[PDB]
Ligand binder design. Sequence first.
Ligand SMILES: Nc1ncnc2c1ncn2[C@@H]1O[C@H](COP(=O)(O)OP(=O)(O)O)[C@@H](O)[C@H]1O
Lengths: 96, 318, 344, 120, 155, 139, 54, 103
Amino acid sequence: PSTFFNLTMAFSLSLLGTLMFRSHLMSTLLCLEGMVLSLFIMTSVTSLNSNSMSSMPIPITILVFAACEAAVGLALLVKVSNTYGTDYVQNLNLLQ
Amino acid sequence: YGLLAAILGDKTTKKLHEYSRVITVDGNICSGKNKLAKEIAQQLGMKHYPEAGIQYSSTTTGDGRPLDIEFSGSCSLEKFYDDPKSNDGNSYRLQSWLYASRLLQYADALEHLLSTGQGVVLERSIYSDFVFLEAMYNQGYIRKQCVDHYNEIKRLTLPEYLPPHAVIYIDVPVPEVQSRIQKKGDPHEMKVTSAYLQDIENAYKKTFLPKMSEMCEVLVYDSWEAEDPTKVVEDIEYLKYNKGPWLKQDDWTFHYLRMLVQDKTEVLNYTTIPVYLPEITIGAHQGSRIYNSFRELPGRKYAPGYNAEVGDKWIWLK
Amino acid sequence: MNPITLAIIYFTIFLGPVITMSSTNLMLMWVGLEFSLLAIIPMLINKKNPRSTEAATKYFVTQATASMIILLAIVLNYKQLGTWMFQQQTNGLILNMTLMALSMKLGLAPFHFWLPEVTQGIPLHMGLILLTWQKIAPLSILIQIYPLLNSTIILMLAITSIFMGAWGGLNQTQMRKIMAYSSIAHMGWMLAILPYNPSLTLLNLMIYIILTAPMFMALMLNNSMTINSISLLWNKTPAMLTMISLMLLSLGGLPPLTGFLPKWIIITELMKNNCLIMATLMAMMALLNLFFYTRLIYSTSLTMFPTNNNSKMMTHQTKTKPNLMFSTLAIMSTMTLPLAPQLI
Amino acid sequence: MMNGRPGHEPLKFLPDEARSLPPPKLNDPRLVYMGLLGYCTGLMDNMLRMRPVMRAGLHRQLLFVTSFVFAGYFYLKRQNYLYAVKDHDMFGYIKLHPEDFPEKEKKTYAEILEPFHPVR
Amino acid sequence: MNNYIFVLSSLFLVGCLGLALKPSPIYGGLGLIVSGFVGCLMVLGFGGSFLGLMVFLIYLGGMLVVFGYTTAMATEEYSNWLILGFLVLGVIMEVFLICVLNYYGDWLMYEVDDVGVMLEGGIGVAAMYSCATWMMVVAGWSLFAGIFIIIEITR
Amino acid sequence: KRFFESYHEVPDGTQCHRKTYITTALGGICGIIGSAYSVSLNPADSTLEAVARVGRYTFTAAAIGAMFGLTTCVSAQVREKPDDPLNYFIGGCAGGLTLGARTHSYGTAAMGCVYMGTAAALFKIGKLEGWELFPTPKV
Amino acid sequence: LDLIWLEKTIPKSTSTLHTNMTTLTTNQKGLIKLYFMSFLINIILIIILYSINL
Amino acid sequence: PFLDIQKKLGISLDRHFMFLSAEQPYKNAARCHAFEKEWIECAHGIGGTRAKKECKIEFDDFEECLLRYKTMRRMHDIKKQREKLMKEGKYTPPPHHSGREEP
Ligand SMILES: Nc1ncnc2c1ncn2[C@@H]1O[C@H](COP(=O)(O)OP(=O)(O)O)[C@@H](O)[C@H]1O
């Protein structure tokens, strides 16, 4: 019900976030994760009220893939503040 | 040589031994380094590579007979000396071809080192070429941009290759070399303004020597230590090959370096970068002719193994 | 790369698209997309040059948010239909999300900014994979769902891409980016016919792959990322000058060569479906693409640019040969047109 | 399109039903083209690798002219089937849904007044 | 309190709002932690236990922990107050929107098997080992590859 | 949306008021979108500077919208021809001219007039001949 | 009429028109924030394109 | 799907669990199981284009078992108007709403 519209807007508020950087790569990698939580919560919620137990595997597969996804994301982040001493995105403007 | 070979043995790790190092000996225009080199080589069986020449690449490729000057880039060290600050710039073209020649020599040396396992003495190297250009710019020989173009080629290609393990060095004050020149008489070599010889050594002394000191083992020898290959050889066998970037070269790292030197067309890929300074430019009409003519030489019109002129056979099944 | 790692990565970069294509449970299609994202990032930074880290960090963020949007579409569907897969009933907004998202991973139209930049900082080799074995995956997902997607949006993204790709290409002089821009354009044609005849999308792709794969292995044979660099092709390796000429004109739609067929049948299918408005404008600016293709032709073949003396040195040395694939993919591409009826 | 047809072989190249169709004559101009297309690939390769263009790899030349051609017979054999299915499918529908595809009868010119635009 | 669920959803939304405002990476991590807590709460609210725990031992656990670790390293430089202000701005707007429908916990636990003996969260996900045996193989390959991707990307 | 469509419903040349209003809005809408892309990319230096650019683009676009609407509608009444594509061309002709002025360039007015008018004319023909844009797949 | 007027109008003008487009379309900062927001704008317009043509 | 390597190989790694009415663990049927069957045995052999008009009764019902919105609506109305009747003191919960009962 409405519970779902809050979670969905949470994902859109997290969407507006990842698409509007604020000079901190880490913060973004952190917003990105806010979505995965919202997706995980929504998937788990409907699976639970549909009594669809055959699908519970998914709520977790979503997290397992999302965790590594984030692992890759942070290694890129560490790589950046090793080459530029900061995670600030402006630095990432060489490919112009 | 490829990953396949490397995967199954063929590791540079298994082919290295104490005597296996890249040792260059650098000196002024006449440091007797030619002699020291051969001996050091004779001592550890090191493959002694001769100093890089205009036609060193031609001796390297195919028949190995010396190429015509225009085929070898039209460079004269002879004209370098008799006509300094020439309108056509033969001196810069000479220097750029020389850098390409040592790039080929250094890469051929590294290929022998990682494959055979034998070490290599290369006399002067890409690492010790800049002193001639520094002196030339200090003199009216080359203009500032010319310098930038060489530096750009050096920055693009030299870092990939591993540094000389040690860099045996001779020193003989300018008066000495000039006098040494007089003994082997050659009209061209003879007319080399001292100040230019001053600038060559100055660079080694100030720039090249300390530069490599941090990177590789530095053994500087006074003329007297020289002419005594035994003693110098002894000292090399004495130094400890520790400090330097060579320490991190694991087998899986060497493989890629080997596959580079294994490909000459890449070694000097950045030597032909399309930067159009006027001396370097072939020019399309002249360049096309020189090509149609270099490519028509016997054994060159087709890849090695396929040109029948020199006596290749089995082409119809190759 | 420890050859073991090379295998794991390459397997993933290859298991990535294959799981997507084979599975029907969308979820399994999403993770196929996810594995491709994870596998490509290591290779992208192989030189680890400062430009590279920038490339990967962009590619990754663009890829990641799109991946999350695709997952949201699957999560929403799960509530609007218990099924884990798009159906006739699917809410229209649910599908449009999937189009935008998938059009970001494929990099079409107003989301075409990441591709040119990542194509600029990655090696020529990984450039090919990033352009052609990473487009197969998302396109598969779209082609499967074609009956349901919107004809309007696709067309807009199609036309936009064609324009952006063309206009972008005109100014670019870096080859990697000229190709990135071409890919945006061709990708556009492909997505134009998806709603109408998916089978033609799979032709306008293969032909693009059979055209781009030879073109890039050509750019790297001499590893030239500059037109000035490819222009001295006449000295470094003269034979490839002939086919490089035809393949690039083939990439644009000129009639004798194989490249006309994809544009010709896409136009025939769109006119059959009555889009004689859309098809006309696309074909017209498609002609802009050939202008920048021919400008390169000029520099590389029809006119001989001046070269450097140091080049004579590279001639001497035996040139490492181009793999056989170049030939088989150059000819099958430059001239198969006489065999079009079977291809379609 | 043609996928989703009853009986579709989910991953097969050419269903046996294609046996009913005539086999492609080995000298079909197309297969012969593929042959020439192939010979050229071979010749091109020799050229790009800087070998005597025609007098080299006479074994390869054969692999090429004979690989392309081999591919052809078995491809054309299929594409031929696909087209043949298309008719089976198309013609059938015209009948099963006859009213929609009605055999109209045109009138002879004697009856049809076609407009005359005088060139003058 | 039937409103319990809505209340929770709102809190979650607000937390994600903060993350959206992109505060200091550490503040962001903290905010997410709060949201993740809210999340496990909601899932548990429906009845799913194992599921709720996971996010806790995974997100409220290391997911943000490493982030935290990470930030310490790459985030050094500390308007958060202004951000807090906008947050209140959003809160009221959020509330205003619900008040919009205001003018214009009734049904949860929509259906339940009062008597049941082997129904409970986790059992379904336990079927990763049987009748869903392709989820967990692909996830395992994901982890086994991710090891390699991170080790080279750091290399 | 029932709004914009209205433009087409009443016969051309009639009720110019509504035509001009609708045309002005569309231009203005495009102005906003155009300014947005122009500000998102190629950003400004100060918020105000960008607010100005939004305004500039919006007004210019709104103007081209108005004159197009006004000229085409009026050209129709005066010419007593409501379905003559030329009407629109005169309108597009005018629209381009406004763009040219707002960009302070006679040359732009040239290209603008021809290109813009032609486009508008084609719209009229399109409507007259029932051309379909972005059509549904009917194969 | 030959040379300038018939070369400035058809052949040259078309030359000038598009070059301006590429220049304006291809003069990009290269910064990710800018580019990304453009993705934002797109999502917004497409959301609407569906909405208004519901 | 795009490449049916699954049907060909006969394997079913991805099909066994795509809808709610599929085998549930320990044979515990999921909710709505009464309709999805009726809505997919209907649309079997009939393609989608014709699974979308004539098999609309079964989706309109399955769209209501799951979403269960018409119920919400009806009930909500009952609630609102009951409020109005209570408003007019017409109605108040009986012991029916609150009373003892069978096991
Ligand atoms: N960069 C350069 N420019 C000009 N000449 C060079 C350069 N590098 C090396 N040479 C030539 O190499 C020669 C070395 O002298 P030579 O007596 O032949 O051998 P050695 O240096 O061992 O004594 C010099 O005569 C010098 O002209």
